[PDB]
Every structure is written in structure tokens, then in C-alpha cells.
């Protein structure tokens, strides 16, 4: 197949002002949200139709009880982080865990933490060590690497448990995640500033969001000073992007789901 992934995020805000919750937890398959929980509703709920249809109520009941506990874990860890930094006020604490299923059958896993939106700890599952960015992170790291069995548990989840859950969600929502919608690609030409011509290569309508676009001069070397647009969500489940150059014969090259396209500029 193509490259798929599963990721769980956690956010903890100390002293949330007004509406902002104290704890949010959201899970994604690729760019699709699948599960959500937060300290206001205190319920683990589905965020994709094919998750609700294929998971029995007791799954949601059971992970609500865990997230309620993980909510409390996070609140406390954030408190000891601020104490270590001698920080008062409102600060944040984030965790990302997940795994990827590669096109060629190999796999990756990541488990990361962040404080005020910056890298704090990084797990290396192939050496079972935590990488720390500063002296505070080094303190937490020492406690975590003291517990040999938990480091082994973390590795087993990232290589086995996570990849099994991802394969399960893939099947549950295959009509969504494995579909392919090809890009609609056009080239626009326009004289902008006296003597400058701007060539724009626009794509839209495609899914999955991963697409390659580039400009080539005389068929061989890529042209320099290309400008790239972000791959933006269009709102209907598909995506758009572009690339532009200024200025021989030029051509746009688009590659998407194993189909190459070439748009020669007149």
C-alpha cells in the first residue's frame, strides 16, 4: 500500500483561562481524526463514522476510564515540570506517540514529549533510552530509565500493539483511507511586473494529500527559485497545492499515487 500512520496526542494546560480545557486527547489515522477526549466532557468519543460503526460501546467505556486516569497523570507531571523550572503561571505539556506502516513493509515508532510547545524528551526504542534537551529533562529521564520493564513495555507497544491497531483502523475505514482522487492540474501564465512572467502550477481535488510538484527547464534540470504553496485542506476531504517560477521551454511535473503528469507551458 501507501504509507499509513496512527498518532495519539495529549495536551495539558495549567491554569486554563475561560473555555480552554485542562486536558485534550485526540487520535488520528493519517490526517483523519478518529478519537477524542477532554477534561470538560470527560468522555472518549469517536470522531470518524467508520470508528463509531466498528467499535462496540464497551471499548469507549473502557478507554474513558483510562483517559480519566491519564488526565490526572498529566496534571501532576505538569506541576513537577513547573516546579523544576521555577515557573509560575500557565504552561503547556504535550505528548505524541504513534507508528507508521511503510510502503515497503518496514515500520517506525515515535514517542515524544514537549514543554511550552518545545522538544523535551524523545524515546529511542532501538536503544531504550530517553534523549533529554536540558538539565530538567535529564532529571525526568533518569527516573524513566531506572524502570527497565516499562522501557521494554514501551518498545513492545510501538512495534507490535500500535501497528496492529493501525492495521485494524485501516480495514474499518478502507473506503476512506485507501481511495484515490487524482489531482486536477492546470498551468497559468501571466506578466506581472514589467518584464517578469510568473508561471503558476495549481493542483486541487486530490486525495491522499501527499503530492509531488516541480518545475523543470528543457526537460532535465529543475529550475531554481521555485515557490511552493502549502497543501491545504479543501473542506470536502480533498486537498490543493501549487508551485510557481519566473522566467527555453518549461514544464510542470506532478506525481501522485503512482501516476506521473507533465504539463508543458506553451
Amino acid at each position, epitope marked *: 500500500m501507501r504509507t499509513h500512520s496512527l498518532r495519539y496526542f495529549r495536551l495539558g494546560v495549567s491554569d486554563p483561562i475561560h473555555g480552554v480545557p485542562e486536558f485534550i486527547s485526540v487520535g488520528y489515522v493519517d490526517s483523519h481524526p478518529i478519537t477524542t477526549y477532554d477534561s470538560v466532557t470527560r468522555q472518549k468519543e469517536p470522531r470518524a463514522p467508520w470508528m463509531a460503526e466498528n467499535l462496540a460501546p464497551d471499548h469507549w467505556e473502557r478507554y474513558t476510564q483510562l483517559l480519566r*486516569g491519564w488526565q490526572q497523570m498529566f496534571k501532576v507531571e505538569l506541576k513537577r515540570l513547573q516546579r523544576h523550572y521555577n515557573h509560575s503561571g500557565s504552561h503547556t505539556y504535550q505528548r505524541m506517540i504513534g507508528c507508521e506502516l511503510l510502503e515497503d513493509g518496514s515500520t517506525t515508532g515515535f514517542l515524544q514529549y514537549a514543554y511550552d510547545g518545545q522538544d523535551f524528551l524523545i524515546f529511542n526504542k532501538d536503544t531504550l533510552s530517553w534523549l533529554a534537551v536540558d538539565n530538567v529533562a535529564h532529571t525526568i529521564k533518569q527516573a524513566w530509565e531506572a524502570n527497565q520493564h516499562e522501557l521494554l513495555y514501551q518498545k513492545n507497544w510501538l512495534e*507490535e500493539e500500535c501497528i496492529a491497531w493501525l492495521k485494524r483502523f485501516l480495514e474499518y475505514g478502507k473506503d476512506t483511507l485507501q481511495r484515490t482522487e487524482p489531482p486536477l492540474v492546470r498551468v497559468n501564465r501571466k506578466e506581472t511586473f514589467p518584464g517578469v512572467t510568473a508561471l503558476f502550477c495549481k493542483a486541487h481535488g486530490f486525495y491522499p494529500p501527499e503530492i509531488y510538484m516541480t518545475w523543470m527547464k528543457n526537460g532535465e534540470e529543475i529550475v531554481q527559485e521555485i515557490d511552493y504553496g502549502d497543501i491545504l485542506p479543501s473542506g470536502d476531504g480533498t486537498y490543493q497545492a501549487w508551485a510557481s517560477i519566473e522566467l527555453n521551454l518549461y514544464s510542470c511535473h506532478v506525481e501522485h499515487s503512482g501516476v506521473h503528469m507533465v504539463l508543458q507551458v506553451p
Partner: antibody, heavy 109, light 114 residues
Framework: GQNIDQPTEMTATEGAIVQINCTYQ??????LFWYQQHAGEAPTFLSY??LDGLEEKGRFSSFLSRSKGYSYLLLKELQMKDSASYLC??????????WGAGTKLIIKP | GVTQTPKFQVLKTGQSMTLQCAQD?????MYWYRQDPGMGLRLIYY???????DKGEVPNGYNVSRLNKREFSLRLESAAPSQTSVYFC??????????????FGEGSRLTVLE
């Protein structure tokens, strides 16, 4: 998951070696525990395995095989004081323990 | 470590019973189990952390109250003979961490008669 199976009773001679098997069929696997329970008393932790290998804590070692879905608890130089029940438990993919019904170990002197 | 009471108790059918369990370990998860011959521990109720509880394998006939981080009560609403069993309270540091083990209390041998 559903099933965890361990023999009901096992008997061996003091000074010898006994091995207690626990085979498990569960949906997901987040670890395997061995607990010791002397008759009349409460269980106590002995061993945790989540990856393949053998781990030794003195006279007791515990072994996990992931592709084969079994563990065994192995005791060397059996003393009489090792008469007890050995409970085997597996955390499934939802972190719920599944408990085996225990193995009563009898030691002939 | 983990303390529960009483060690023994006789009950006439229909009576009420409350089993007490307390731990000074700063543990978050606590469990109520019963142990009957020929089968493994069956969970009655658990509390993943202070402020929540949920049912387990065999909840009918009981309810639980997580009073504070340290204490977790088991109440028998209207005792039946089939509730004769040995009762075990246990705690762990957190439910979610896959490696952590259970610490068990001494047990409550409880016999129910007509």
C-alpha cells in the same frame, strides 16, 4: 482476550527442577505476570515479561515466547517452602488482566 | 502496604456489609477481586484513579466508592449465599502503564448463610 490456560496441579521432588507453563490466546498483548500465592495468603508479584527471552531472579526464572503465546515459570533447587499456587496473568490490548486459574505446586520431600 | 478489613465475617442472607481497603503507597488505581476455587481472580469493580470507578467482570450485587486517593470501599447491598468468597483488594501505580504490578491486601474471608 479470552483464554489463559495453566495446569491445575503439579508435583515434583525437592531439590529438582519444575517448569510451569502458561499458554494464552488473547487479543493484544501488553505483558505477562507470574504471581505467587501461599495457601491462606494473598498473591505477590514474581515476574513480568513483555518481550522474548528468559529473566532470572535467583532460583526463579520466567520465560516468554511471543510467536508461540506461552510463558513458563521455572524453579531450581525446589525447597519445601516453594509449595504454593502460581497464578499467571496477561494484560490484553485494553490493559485488562486475564487471570489463569492457578497451578498448585506440591513438593514431595 | 495495602490494608483491608475484616479478615473474617459471617452474614445472614439479606444483611449489609462494607469492606474497607486503604493503601499508603500513593497509588492511583485500586481493584476489588474475589477468588473462588477452580477459577482465576474475577474483578468486581476498579477505580483507575481518584474520582472515577467502573464495573468489572461480576458487578451484580455490589457497588464501590472511591472516597479518596487512598481508600476504596466494597459494599454488599443485600447479601446472597453465592457471594460467599475470599475478597482481595489490590492497588497499582497507574492502570495504563503496562509494566506495573498489583499489590494485594491480606484478604477478607466472608461466609453468607440463611
Amino acid at each position: 482476550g479470552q483464554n489463559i490456560d495453566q495446569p491445575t496441579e503439579m508435583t515434583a521432588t525437592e531439590g529438582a527442577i519444575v517448569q510451569i507453563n502458561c499458554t494464552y490466546q488473547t487479543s493484544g498483548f501488553n505483558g505477562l505476570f507470574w504471581y505467587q500465592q501461599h495457601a491462606g495468603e494473598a498473591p505477590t508479584f514474581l515476574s513480568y515479561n513483555v518481550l522474548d527471552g528468559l529473566e532470572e531472579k535467583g532460583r526463579f526464572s520466567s520465560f516468554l515466547s511471543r510467536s508461540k503465546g506461552y510463558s513458563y515459570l521455572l524453579l531450581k533447587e525446589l525447597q519445601m517452602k516453594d509449595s504454593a499456587s502460581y497464578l499467571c496473568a496477561v494484560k490484553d490490548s485494553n490493559y485488562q488482566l486475564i487471570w489463569g486459574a492457578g497451578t498448585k505446586l506440591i513438593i514431595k520431600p | 502496604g495495602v490494608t483491608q478489613t475484616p479478615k473474617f465475617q459471617v452474614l445472614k442472607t439479606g444483611q449489609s456489609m462494607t469492606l474497607q481497603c486503604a493503601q499508603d503507597m500513593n497509588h492511583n488505581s485500586m481493584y476489588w477481586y474475589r477468588q473462588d476455587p477452580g477459577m482465576g481472580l474475577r474483578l468486581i469493580y476498579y477505580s483507575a484513579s481518584e474520582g472515577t470507578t467502573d464495573k468489572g467482570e461480576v458487578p451484580n450485587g455490589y457497588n464501590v466508592s472511591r472516597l479518596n486517593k487512598r481508600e476504596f470501599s466494597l459494599r454488599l447491598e443485600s447479601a446472597a449465599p453465592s457471594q460467599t468468597s475470599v475478597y482481595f483488594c489490590a492497588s497499582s501505580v497507574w492502570t495504563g502503564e503496562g509494566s506495573g504490578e498489583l499489590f494485594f491486601g491480606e484478604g477478607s474471608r466472608l461466609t453468607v448463610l440463611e
